[PDB]
Structures are given as C-alpha cells and as structure tokens.
PDB file of C-alpha atoms in Angstrom:
ATOM      1  CA  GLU A   1     -80.401 -80.652  53.251  1.00 39.30           C
ATOM      2  CA  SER A   2     -76.435 -80.579  53.500  1.00 34.57           C
ATOM      3  CA  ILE A   3     -75.498 -77.150  51.984  1.00 33.89           C
ATOM      4  CA  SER A   4     -74.034 -78.610  48.815  1.00 36.33           C
ATOM      5  CA  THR A   5     -77.524 -80.201  47.964  1.00 34.77           C
ATOM      6  CA  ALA A   6     -79.107 -76.778  48.510  1.00 32.97           C
ATOM      7  CA  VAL A   7     -76.624 -75.268  46.182  1.00 31.86           C
ATOM      8  CA  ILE A   8     -76.926 -77.795  43.255  1.00 33.25           C
ATOM      9  CA  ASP A   9     -80.727 -77.301  43.483  1.00 33.05           C
ATOM     10  CA  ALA A  10     -80.746 -73.505  43.589  1.00 35.89           C
ATOM     11  CA  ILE A  11     -78.428 -73.622  40.475  1.00 37.78           C
ATOM     12  CA  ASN A  12     -80.873 -75.798  38.406  1.00 39.66           C
ATOM     13  CA  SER A  13     -83.775 -74.016  40.060  1.00 42.43           C
ATOM     14  CA  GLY A  14     -82.224 -70.560  38.829  1.00 39.26           C
ATOM     15  CA  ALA A  15     -82.736 -68.588  42.026  1.00 38.77           C
ATOM     16  CA  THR A  16     -80.506 -67.672  44.864  1.00 33.40           C
ATOM     17  CA  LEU A  17     -80.376 -69.345  48.185  1.00 32.38           C
ATOM     18  CA  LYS A  18     -81.136 -65.961  49.739  1.00 33.77           C
ATOM     19  CA  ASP A  19     -84.503 -66.027  47.985  1.00 33.28           C
ATOM     20  CA  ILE A  20     -85.208 -69.727  48.441  1.00 30.81           C
ATOM     21  CA  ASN A  21     -84.676 -69.411  52.381  1.00 29.13           C
ATOM     22  CA  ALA A  22     -86.392 -66.057  52.141  1.00 32.44           C
ATOM     23  CA  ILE A  23     -83.574 -64.291  54.248  1.00 32.59           C
ATOM     24  CA  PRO A  24     -84.382 -60.620  55.129  1.00 33.58           C
ATOM     25  CA  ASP A  25     -82.392 -57.946  53.265  1.00 34.99           C
ATOM     26  CA  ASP A  26     -81.405 -56.155  56.516  1.00 35.23           C
ATOM     27  CA  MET A  27     -79.632 -59.500  57.280  1.00 35.63           C
ATOM     28  CA  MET A  28     -77.456 -59.988  54.229  1.00 35.61           C
ATOM     29  CA  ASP A  29     -76.616 -56.348  54.751  1.00 36.55           C
ATOM     30  CA  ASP A  30     -75.438 -56.645  58.221  1.00 39.71           C
ATOM     31  CA  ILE A  31     -73.314 -59.691  57.229  1.00 38.35           C
ATOM     32  CA  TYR A  32     -71.624 -57.719  54.311  1.00 38.21           C
ATOM     33  CA  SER A  33     -70.895 -54.933  56.689  1.00 36.38           C
ATOM     34  CA  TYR A  34     -68.988 -57.287  59.004  1.00 33.97           C
ATOM     35  CA  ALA A  35     -67.412 -58.951  56.045  1.00 30.59           C
ATOM     36  CA  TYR A  36     -66.133 -55.709  54.685  1.00 29.62           C
ATOM     37  CA  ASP A  37     -65.062 -54.660  58.116  1.00 32.69           C
ATOM     38  CA  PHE A  38     -62.616 -57.511  58.283  1.00 32.07           C
ATOM     39  CA  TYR A  39     -61.551 -56.796  54.738  1.00 29.24           C
ATOM     40  CA  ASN A  40     -60.535 -53.224  55.456  1.00 27.34           C
ATOM     41  CA  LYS A  41     -58.913 -54.102  58.525  1.00 24.76           C
ATOM     42  CA  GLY A  42     -56.625 -56.317  56.483  1.00 25.38           C
ATOM     43  CA  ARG A  43     -57.910 -59.608  58.067  1.00 25.99           C
ATOM     44  CA  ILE A  44     -58.158 -61.561  54.889  1.00 26.67           C
ATOM     45  CA  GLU A  45     -58.624 -65.044  56.509  1.00 27.16           C
ATOM     46  CA  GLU A  46     -61.807 -63.899  58.325  1.00 27.48           C
ATOM     47  CA  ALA A  47     -62.911 -61.721  55.545  1.00 27.44           C
ATOM     48  CA  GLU A  48     -62.867 -64.716  53.317  1.00 29.37           C
ATOM     49  CA  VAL A  49     -65.203 -66.932  55.212  1.00 28.29           C
ATOM     50  CA  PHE A  50     -67.980 -64.284  55.176  1.00 27.90           C
ATOM     51  CA  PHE A  51     -67.522 -63.410  51.508  1.00 28.13           C
ATOM     52  CA  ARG A  52     -67.658 -66.995  50.633  1.00 29.22           C
ATOM     53  CA  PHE A  53     -70.791 -67.537  52.546  1.00 33.41           C
ATOM     54  CA  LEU A  54     -72.245 -64.436  50.744  1.00 32.33           C
ATOM     55  CA  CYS A  55     -71.246 -65.663  47.413  1.00 33.63           C
ATOM     56  CA  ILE A  56     -72.973 -68.910  48.141  1.00 36.71           C
ATOM     57  CA  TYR A  57     -76.198 -67.446  49.321  1.00 35.81           C
ATOM     58  CA  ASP A  58     -76.497 -64.952  46.491  1.00 37.56           C
ATOM     59  CA  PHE A  59     -74.382 -65.948  43.440  1.00 37.96           C
ATOM     60  CA  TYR A  60     -75.787 -62.978  41.485  1.00 37.72           C
ATOM     61  CA  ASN A  61     -74.782 -60.252  43.773  1.00 39.50           C
ATOM     62  CA  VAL A  62     -71.971 -58.147  42.122  1.00 38.26           C
ATOM     63  CA  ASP A  63     -70.999 -56.563  45.390  1.00 42.01           C
ATOM     64  CA  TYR A  64     -70.397 -60.002  46.946  1.00 38.83           C
ATOM     65  CA  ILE A  65     -68.541 -61.515  44.073  1.00 39.08           C
ATOM     66  CA  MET A  66     -66.259 -58.507  43.882  1.00 39.30           C
ATOM     67  CA  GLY A  67     -65.595 -58.879  47.534  1.00 40.25           C
ATOM     68  CA  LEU A  68     -64.527 -62.468  47.156  1.00 41.76           C
ATOM     69  CA  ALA A  69     -62.557 -61.874  43.972  1.00 43.26           C
ATOM     70  CA  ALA A  70     -60.652 -59.187  45.738  1.00 44.21           C
ATOM     71  CA  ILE A  71     -59.718 -61.696  48.273  1.00 44.34           C
ATOM     72  CA  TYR A  72     -58.634 -64.330  45.772  1.00 47.78           C
ATOM     73  CA  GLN A  73     -56.436 -61.706  44.132  1.00 50.21           C
ATOM     74  CA  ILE A  74     -54.843 -60.696  47.389  1.00 51.33           C
ATOM     75  CA  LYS A  75     -53.732 -64.231  48.085  1.00 50.06           C
ATOM     76  CA  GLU A  76     -52.472 -64.583  44.583  1.00 49.66           C
ATOM     77  CA  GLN A  77     -55.142 -67.061  43.613  1.00 50.53           C
ATOM     78  CA  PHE A  78     -55.123 -65.225  40.253  1.00 50.29           C
ATOM     79  CA  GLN A  79     -57.146 -67.544  38.140  1.00 50.09           C
ATOM     80  CA  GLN A  80     -59.980 -67.858  40.683  1.00 47.70           C
ATOM     81  CA  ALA A  81     -59.979 -64.112  41.090  1.00 46.61           C
ATOM     82  CA  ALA A  82     -60.225 -63.656  37.304  1.00 44.99           C
ATOM     83  CA  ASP A  83     -63.053 -66.234  36.976  1.00 45.48           C
ATOM     84  CA  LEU A  84     -64.996 -64.317  39.623  1.00 44.91           C
ATOM     85  CA  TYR A  85     -64.175 -61.011  37.970  1.00 43.19           C
ATOM     86  CA  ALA A  86     -65.618 -62.184  34.747  1.00 44.26           C
ATOM     87  CA  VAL A  87     -68.879 -63.166  36.294  1.00 45.95           C
ATOM     88  CA  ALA A  88     -68.961 -59.843  38.212  1.00 48.53           C
ATOM     89  CA  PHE A  89     -68.564 -58.075  34.865  1.00 47.68           C
ATOM     90  CA  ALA A  90     -71.157 -60.015  32.850  1.00 47.96           C
ATOM     91  CA  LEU A  91     -73.403 -59.405  35.854  1.00 44.05           C
ATOM     92  CA  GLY A  92     -72.814 -55.713  35.286  1.00 40.27           C
ATOM     93  CA  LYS A  93     -70.998 -54.599  32.081  1.00 39.41           C
ATOM     94  CA  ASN A  94     -72.070 -51.066  33.005  1.00 36.48           C
ATOM     95  CA  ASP A  95     -69.026 -51.427  35.462  1.00 37.40           C
ATOM     96  CA  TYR A  96     -65.519 -51.584  34.434  1.00 36.62           C
ATOM     97  CA  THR A  97     -63.696 -52.054  37.690  1.00 33.91           C
ATOM     98  CA  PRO A  98     -63.652 -55.853  37.279  1.00 36.64           C
ATOM     99  CA  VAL A  99     -62.334 -55.455  33.780  1.00 36.79           C
ATOM    100  CA  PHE A 100     -59.160 -53.649  35.159  1.00 38.05           C
ATOM    101  CA  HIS A 101     -58.561 -56.187  37.972  1.00 37.59           C
ATOM    102  CA  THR A 102     -58.817 -59.124  35.400  1.00 38.75           C
ATOM    103  CA  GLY A 103     -55.933 -57.320  33.616  1.00 39.23           C
ATOM    104  CA  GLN A 104     -53.860 -57.176  36.726  1.00 41.93           C
ATOM    105  CA  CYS A 105     -54.435 -60.870  37.123  1.00 44.20           C
ATOM    106  CA  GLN A 106     -53.688 -61.858  33.610  1.00 43.72           C
ATOM    107  CA  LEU A 107     -50.360 -60.011  34.203  1.00 44.91           C
ATOM    108  CA  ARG A 108     -49.360 -62.042  37.290  1.00 45.51           C
ATOM    109  CA  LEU A 109     -50.431 -65.156  35.392  1.00 44.46           C
ATOM    110  CA  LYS A 110     -47.703 -64.329  32.902  1.00 43.53           C
ATOM    111  CA  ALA A 111     -50.196 -63.573  30.097  1.00 41.85           C
ATOM    112  CA  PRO A 112     -49.184 -60.115  29.003  1.00 41.04           C
ATOM    113  CA  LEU A 113     -51.396 -60.270  25.897  1.00 38.84           C
ATOM    114  CA  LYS A 114     -54.721 -60.721  27.403  1.00 42.07           C
ATOM    115  CA  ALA A 115     -53.626 -58.362  30.088  1.00 40.82           C
ATOM    116  CA  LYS A 116     -53.549 -55.274  27.865  1.00 40.20           C
ATOM    117  CA  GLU A 117     -56.740 -56.367  26.106  1.00 40.38           C
ATOM    118  CA  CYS A 118     -58.591 -55.613  29.279  1.00 39.66           C
ATOM    119  CA  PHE A 119     -56.617 -52.410  30.102  1.00 39.76           C
ATOM    120  CA  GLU A 120     -57.362 -50.741  26.788  1.00 42.45           C
ATOM    121  CA  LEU A 121     -61.051 -51.406  27.337  1.00 42.59           C
ATOM    122  CA  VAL A 122     -61.064 -49.645  30.725  1.00 41.86           C
ATOM    123  CA  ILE A 123     -59.729 -46.393  29.414  1.00 47.05           C
ATOM    124  CA  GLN A 124     -62.007 -46.660  26.477  1.00 46.01           C
ATOM    125  CA  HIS A 125     -65.279 -47.199  28.342  1.00 46.37           C
ATOM    126  CA  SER A 126     -65.008 -46.252  31.993  1.00 44.86           C
ATOM    127  CA  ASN A 127     -66.028 -42.744  32.841  1.00 44.90           C
ATOM    128  CA  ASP A 128     -64.049 -43.470  36.104  1.00 44.61           C
ATOM    129  CA  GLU A 129     -61.042 -41.127  36.164  1.00 43.29           C
ATOM    130  CA  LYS A 130     -59.018 -42.629  38.851  1.00 40.91           C
ATOM    131  CA  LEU A 131     -59.563 -45.909  36.951  1.00 40.16           C
ATOM    132  CA  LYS A 132     -58.417 -44.669  33.620  1.00 39.05           C
ATOM    133  CA  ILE A 133     -55.135 -43.389  35.043  1.00 34.70           C
ATOM    134  CA  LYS A 134     -54.353 -46.798  36.502  1.00 33.53           C
ATOM    135  CA  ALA A 135     -55.364 -48.593  33.380  1.00 34.33           C
ATOM    136  CA  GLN A 136     -53.077 -46.359  31.493  1.00 35.33           C
ATOM    137  CA  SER A 137     -49.925 -46.812  33.553  1.00 34.09           C
ATOM    138  CA  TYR A 138     -50.328 -50.616  33.218  1.00 36.81           C
ATOM    139  CA  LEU A 139     -50.470 -50.079  29.612  1.00 36.86           C
ATOM    140  CA  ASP A 140     -47.320 -47.889  29.567  1.00 36.14           C
ATOM    141  CA  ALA A 141     -45.382 -49.914  32.003  1.00 38.14           C
ATOM    142  CA  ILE A 142     -45.966 -53.106  29.913  1.00 38.78           C
ATOM    143  CA  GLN A 143     -45.055 -51.655  26.585  1.00 41.46           C
TER     144      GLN A 143
ATOM    145  CA  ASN B   1     -78.180 -69.916  30.288  1.00 41.99           C
ATOM    146  CA  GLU B   2     -77.735 -68.610  33.868  1.00 43.65           C
ATOM    147  CA  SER B   3     -74.813 -70.874  34.576  1.00 42.89           C
ATOM    148  CA  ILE B   4     -73.513 -67.686  36.026  1.00 40.51           C
ATOM    149  CA  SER B   5     -74.273 -69.443  39.216  1.00 42.76           C
ATOM    150  CA  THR B   6     -72.341 -72.540  37.993  1.00 42.15           C
ATOM    151  CA  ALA B   7     -69.304 -70.372  37.377  1.00 38.39           C
ATOM    152  CA  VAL B   8     -69.375 -68.624  40.708  1.00 39.10           C
ATOM    153  CA  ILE B   9     -69.835 -71.937  42.528  1.00 42.10           C
ATOM    154  CA  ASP B  10     -67.112 -73.603  40.348  1.00 41.40           C
ATOM    155  CA  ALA B  11     -64.552 -70.880  40.956  1.00 40.98           C
ATOM    156  CA  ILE B  12     -65.276 -70.986  44.696  1.00 40.11           C
ATOM    157  CA  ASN B  13     -64.763 -74.696  44.577  1.00 37.65           C
ATOM    158  CA  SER B  14     -61.329 -74.574  43.148  1.00 35.39           C
ATOM    159  CA  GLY B  15     -59.454 -73.774  46.413  1.00 37.16           C
ATOM    160  CA  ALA B  16     -58.571 -76.253  49.105  1.00 38.97           C
ATOM    161  CA  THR B  17     -60.060 -75.739  52.635  1.00 38.53           C
ATOM    162  CA  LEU B  18     -59.144 -76.662  56.167  1.00 38.83           C
ATOM    163  CA  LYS B  19     -61.890 -79.218  56.338  1.00 39.05           C
ATOM    164  CA  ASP B  20     -61.454 -80.225  52.593  1.00 39.37           C
ATOM    165  CA  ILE B  21     -57.897 -81.589  52.891  1.00 44.42           C
ATOM    166  CA  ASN B  22     -58.840 -84.008  55.643  1.00 46.82           C
ATOM    167  CA  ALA B  23     -55.942 -83.504  57.916  1.00 50.38           C
ATOM    168  CA  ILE B  24     -57.749 -83.232  61.211  1.00 53.78           C
ATOM    169  CA  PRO B  25     -59.251 -86.413  62.544  1.00 54.41           C
ATOM    170  CA  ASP B  26     -62.999 -86.484  63.393  1.00 55.50           C
ATOM    171  CA  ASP B  27     -62.581 -87.265  67.189  1.00 56.63           C
ATOM    172  CA  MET B  28     -60.312 -84.355  67.605  1.00 56.99           C
ATOM    173  CA  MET B  29     -62.787 -82.013  65.889  1.00 57.15           C
ATOM    174  CA  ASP B  30     -65.345 -83.463  68.344  1.00 59.46           C
ATOM    175  CA  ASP B  31     -63.135 -82.950  71.420  1.00 62.58           C
ATOM    176  CA  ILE B  32     -62.312 -79.361  70.477  1.00 63.88           C
ATOM    177  CA  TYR B  33     -66.019 -78.603  70.155  1.00 64.65           C
ATOM    178  CA  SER B  34     -66.864 -80.122  73.504  1.00 66.62           C
ATOM    179  CA  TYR B  35     -64.014 -78.194  75.241  1.00 65.37           C
ATOM    180  CA  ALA B  36     -65.028 -74.958  73.495  1.00 61.95           C
ATOM    181  CA  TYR B  37     -68.624 -75.717  74.594  1.00 61.85           C
ATOM    182  CA  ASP B  38     -67.746 -76.791  78.025  1.00 63.76           C
ATOM    183  CA  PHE B  39     -65.531 -73.794  78.505  1.00 63.79           C
ATOM    184  CA  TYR B  40     -68.633 -71.736  77.638  1.00 61.69           C
ATOM    185  CA  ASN B  41     -70.798 -73.262  80.449  1.00 62.98           C
ATOM    186  CA  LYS B  42     -68.136 -72.726  83.066  1.00 67.03           C
ATOM    187  CA  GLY B  43     -67.830 -69.084  82.205  1.00 66.71           C
ATOM    188  CA  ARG B  44     -64.419 -69.343  80.627  1.00 66.01           C
ATOM    189  CA  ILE B  45     -65.180 -66.937  78.010  1.00 66.07           C
ATOM    190  CA  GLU B  46     -61.903 -65.745  76.401  1.00 64.33           C
ATOM    191  CA  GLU B  47     -60.889 -69.265  75.630  1.00 65.06           C
ATOM    192  CA  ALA B  48     -64.331 -70.410  74.581  1.00 65.43           C
ATOM    193  CA  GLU B  49     -64.290 -67.625  72.148  1.00 66.97           C
ATOM    194  CA  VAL B  50     -61.080 -68.477  70.596  1.00 67.87           C
ATOM    195  CA  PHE B  51     -62.080 -72.042  69.991  1.00 71.18           C
ATOM    196  CA  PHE B  52     -65.378 -71.288  68.593  1.00 68.82           C
ATOM    197  CA  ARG B  53     -63.841 -68.857  66.239  1.00 68.42           C
ATOM    198  CA  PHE B  54     -61.495 -71.562  65.165  1.00 67.00           C
ATOM    199  CA  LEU B  55     -64.478 -73.914  64.769  1.00 67.42           C
ATOM    200  CA  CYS B  56     -66.323 -71.228  62.687  1.00 67.80           C
ATOM    201  CA  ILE B  57     -63.276 -70.986  60.459  1.00 65.95           C
ATOM    202  CA  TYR B  58     -62.881 -74.709  60.086  1.00 66.48           C
ATOM    203  CA  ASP B  59     -66.529 -74.996  59.184  1.00 65.69           C
ATOM    204  CA  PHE B  60     -68.560 -71.803  58.785  1.00 64.00           C
ATOM    205  CA  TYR B  61     -71.563 -73.874  57.524  1.00 64.89           C
ATOM    206  CA  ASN B  62     -71.930 -75.779  60.853  1.00 66.45           C
ATOM    207  CA  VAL B  63     -74.659 -74.205  62.752  1.00 69.54           C
ATOM    208  CA  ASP B  64     -73.580 -75.399  66.179  1.00 67.38           C
ATOM    209  CA  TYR B  65     -70.319 -73.539  65.724  1.00 68.64           C
ATOM    210  CA  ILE B  66     -71.855 -70.334  64.367  1.00 69.56           C
ATOM    211  CA  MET B  67     -74.254 -70.308  67.376  1.00 68.26           C
ATOM    212  CA  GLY B  68     -71.598 -70.962  69.958  1.00 69.55           C
ATOM    213  CA  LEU B  69     -69.600 -67.977  68.776  1.00 72.27           C
ATOM    214  CA  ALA B  70     -72.788 -65.847  68.347  1.00 69.42           C
ATOM    215  CA  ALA B  71     -73.924 -66.835  71.820  1.00 70.09           C
ATOM    216  CA  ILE B  72     -70.546 -65.770  73.157  1.00 67.67           C
ATOM    217  CA  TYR B  73     -70.604 -62.376  71.561  1.00 68.18           C
ATOM    218  CA  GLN B  74     -74.204 -61.906  73.046  1.00 66.28           C
ATOM    219  CA  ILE B  75     -72.823 -62.760  76.540  1.00 65.63           C
ATOM    220  CA  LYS B  76     -69.992 -60.373  76.001  1.00 68.48           C
ATOM    221  CA  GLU B  77     -72.518 -57.663  74.934  1.00 68.93           C
ATOM    222  CA  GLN B  78     -71.129 -57.197  71.539  1.00 68.03           C
ATOM    223  CA  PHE B  79     -74.575 -57.105  70.271  1.00 67.56           C
ATOM    224  CA  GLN B  80     -74.017 -56.132  66.682  1.00 70.02           C
ATOM    225  CA  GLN B  81     -71.671 -59.128  66.170  1.00 70.86           C
ATOM    226  CA  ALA B  82     -73.960 -61.545  67.951  1.00 70.55           C
ATOM    227  CA  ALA B  83     -76.559 -60.161  65.518  1.00 68.82           C
ATOM    228  CA  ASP B  84     -74.337 -60.598  62.561  1.00 67.61           C
ATOM    229  CA  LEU B  85     -73.626 -64.208  63.368  1.00 66.18           C
ATOM    230  CA  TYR B  86     -77.197 -65.272  64.344  1.00 64.04           C
ATOM    231  CA  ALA B  87     -77.992 -63.933  60.854  1.00 66.57           C
ATOM    232  CA  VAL B  88     -75.732 -66.574  59.470  1.00 63.51           C
ATOM    233  CA  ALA B  89     -77.063 -69.270  61.752  1.00 62.30           C
ATOM    234  CA  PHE B  90     -80.543 -68.348  60.778  1.00 57.70           C
ATOM    235  CA  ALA B  91     -79.563 -68.779  57.070  1.00 58.65           C
ATOM    236  CA  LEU B  92     -77.852 -72.090  57.536  1.00 58.42           C
ATOM    237  CA  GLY B  93     -80.812 -73.192  59.725  1.00 57.84           C
ATOM    238  CA  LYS B  94     -83.637 -75.292  58.299  1.00 59.24           C
ATOM    239  CA  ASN B  95     -86.689 -73.228  59.446  1.00 56.60           C
ATOM    240  CA  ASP B  96     -85.234 -72.659  62.926  1.00 58.87           C
ATOM    241  CA  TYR B  97     -86.014 -69.172  64.392  1.00 59.10           C
ATOM    242  CA  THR B  98     -83.926 -69.423  67.558  1.00 58.18           C
ATOM    243  CA  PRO B  99     -81.348 -67.166  65.935  1.00 58.73           C
ATOM    244  CA  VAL B 100     -83.938 -64.747  64.869  1.00 60.51           C
ATOM    245  CA  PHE B 101     -85.294 -64.600  68.442  1.00 60.46           C
ATOM    246  CA  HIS B 102     -81.845 -63.828  69.674  1.00 60.24           C
ATOM    247  CA  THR B 103     -81.343 -61.201  66.916  1.00 62.22           C
ATOM    248  CA  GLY B 104     -84.411 -59.532  68.406  1.00 64.24           C
ATOM    249  CA  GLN B 105     -82.953 -59.559  71.929  1.00 64.70           C
ATOM    250  CA  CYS B 106     -79.816 -58.064  70.453  1.00 64.48           C
ATOM    251  CA  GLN B 107     -81.511 -55.302  68.508  1.00 66.58           C
ATOM    252  CA  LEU B 108     -83.257 -54.340  71.626  1.00 72.86           C
ATOM    253  CA  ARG B 109     -80.039 -53.743  73.456  1.00 74.63           C
ATOM    254  CA  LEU B 110     -78.836 -51.982  70.337  1.00 71.82           C
ATOM    255  CA  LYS B 111     -81.557 -49.420  70.513  1.00 73.38           C
ATOM    256  CA  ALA B 112     -83.355 -50.570  67.375  1.00 76.96           C
ATOM    257  CA  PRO B 113     -86.775 -51.131  68.880  1.00 73.79           C
ATOM    258  CA  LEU B 114     -88.192 -51.263  65.306  1.00 72.90           C
ATOM    259  CA  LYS B 115     -85.894 -54.005  64.289  1.00 72.46           C
ATOM    260  CA  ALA B 116     -86.392 -55.969  67.499  1.00 69.93           C
ATOM    261  CA  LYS B 117     -90.218 -55.735  66.745  1.00 72.18           C
ATOM    262  CA  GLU B 118     -90.000 -57.594  63.415  1.00 75.05           C
ATOM    263  CA  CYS B 119     -87.759 -60.436  64.617  1.00 76.05           C
ATOM    264  CA  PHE B 120     -90.137 -61.271  67.424  1.00 76.39           C
ATOM    265  CA  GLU B 121     -92.912 -60.968  64.967  1.00 77.46           C
ATOM    266  CA  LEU B 122     -91.210 -62.991  62.452  1.00 78.35           C
ATOM    267  CA  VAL B 123     -90.806 -65.730  64.993  1.00 79.82           C
ATOM    268  CA  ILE B 124     -94.443 -65.911  65.942  1.00 80.58           C
ATOM    269  CA  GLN B 125     -95.446 -65.899  62.313  1.00 76.98           C
ATOM    270  CA  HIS B 126     -93.186 -68.932  61.313  1.00 76.93           C
ATOM    271  CA  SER B 127     -91.894 -70.852  64.283  1.00 77.90           C
ATOM    272  CA  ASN B 128     -93.222 -74.024  65.792  1.00 79.20           C
ATOM    273  CA  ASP B 129     -91.099 -74.006  68.978  1.00 75.53           C
ATOM    274  CA  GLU B 130     -93.966 -73.031  71.345  1.00 75.42           C
ATOM    275  CA  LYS B 131     -91.723 -72.208  74.303  1.00 73.32           C
ATOM    276  CA  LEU B 132     -89.942 -69.894  71.882  1.00 72.84           C
ATOM    277  CA  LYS B 133     -93.060 -67.948  70.625  1.00 72.50           C
ATOM    278  CA  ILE B 134     -94.164 -67.510  74.183  1.00 73.01           C
ATOM    279  CA  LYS B 135     -90.988 -65.379  74.825  1.00 72.38           C
ATOM    280  CA  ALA B 136     -91.205 -63.709  71.423  1.00 74.61           C
ATOM    281  CA  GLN B 137     -94.670 -62.584  72.541  1.00 76.19           C
ATOM    282  CA  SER B 138     -93.516 -61.494  75.907  1.00 77.77           C
ATOM    283  CA  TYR B 139     -90.921 -59.401  74.251  1.00 77.55           C
ATOM    284  CA  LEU B 140     -93.357 -57.960  71.757  1.00 78.56           C
ATOM    285  CA  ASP B 141     -95.880 -56.664  74.249  1.00 78.41           C
ATOM    286  CA  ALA B 142     -93.155 -55.238  76.398  1.00 79.12           C
ATOM    287  CA  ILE B 143     -91.736 -52.887  73.805  1.00 78.27           C
ATOM    288  CA  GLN B 144     -95.340 -52.211  72.551  1.00 77.92           C
TER     289      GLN B 144
END
C-alpha cells in the first residue's frame, strides 16, 4: 500500500520496486529520458522529482543514483550527494566518476583531507583522461 | 548485506519536501486540485496544466495528480510526455492498466505501432476493467 510501505518491504525483500511491480524496461527508459532532459535544460526542481522517483523504484540503478546525486550536489546538499555517490561507487567500482565528485563534496564540506584522498584515487585508477586532468587540478589547487 | 537500498532511501529521506514541512493546509490542497480538475473539464487548459504541474511537484506519488497532468499533455498532443507520465502513474498504480491503455493510444499517434501493440496486449493480459479491455481489443484489431 502507501508508497513508504512498498519501500520498507522491497528493502527487506532485497529486490527493487521496478521488479516487484514488474514495470517494463521501455518505461523506466522513457522516464529517465525526460528526467535527463530537464536536467540538461537546467530545470533542477523538475529534474529532481523524476530522479527521486527513479531512485525509489530502482535503488540499484547507478545511472539513476548518479542523476540524483548530481542534483543534490548542485543544490549544495553536499552530504546527501556524497552519500549517494558512495552508493553509486560500491554499485560500480569499475567507475571512478563518483569518486571524483565525492571529493568535490568533501571540499565544500570543509574537509580538505578526505577531499584529496578521493582525488588521488581517480588519477591512479581512472582510464578516463578528462577525469584525471580535473582530479589533478583539484589536487594542485588544494596544496 | 544489501543495505545499499537502505542507504539510498536514507539519503533521499534527509531533505525536507513541500509536503513534508506541513505548511499547506489539507482543505487548500483539495481546493487547488478541484479547481485544477474543474479547469480541465471546462477546457481551460493552460491553467489546468499549471496547477497540475504544481500538484505533481507537491506530490509526485499521488496518482490522481500524475494522471491529470498526463491527460493534459495527451489533450495537447504532446504524446511523448503523456506517455512519460502515464508510465509513472502506471508504476504508482496498484494493478491499474488505464495508464497503459493511454500509453498505447499515445504510441499510436507517435508512429510506434509496435509499442502500441504491446500496451493494448498488456492490458488484455492483466486488466480486470472489462470496458477497458474491450477498447484495448478494438485498438489491437485495428492496427492488426
């Protein structure tokens, strides 16, 4: 019943609401398209309600969590953004983008220490060029 | 163990929300809805649209809101959006397939005959609303 109940269950139950309600994949893909669409267009308030809905209906989806964490970061909700970034990362660990962003966040949360901890790790592990350049400047600019 | 889901939900739950701070009184919420709705029935679309979007932002998990907006998009022929929102309704819905039927209508006008096909099918397969399936079938046999 009332969407919170559905959530507590799905948690305990270990599967996503997306599965539980058996929603098509072509549906969650059209919803993510729209969500993103807002996001790019800058509309953070609209983009957030879709990314929140997607994160609820599929708490395992990296693409979704990243979407929402971007949003939290934009609105300077740094801790939340970090929390979501961590998950995104555990859910991947092949991927280093959320590691960078965590760094950024640690910074704005006046924790310079942890901040560089993440940045060094990007450079070291990400094959992503554009991403090592960034990670490096933050490391140089911090000193 | 996979308290991944717990973290995601706990992080999402840290922020306040319009509905969550309890600043708007219940009767006002009702009145805004009835006006939004009422505006819809009298063909005052532009306004109807603005209020339903508000309603969807105030509570995106309330199906009557998502449908209202969805239905507005459909009437305005913004079929892909109508589709996007009926998808949400469908997901919030408890076994209701009305959104799915409407998705089908939309896909049809969006030149995806093949998607249309599976919605209608999907209806017939799982819905009870008889009146509904009777249209889902009419649509099915018309595309062929």
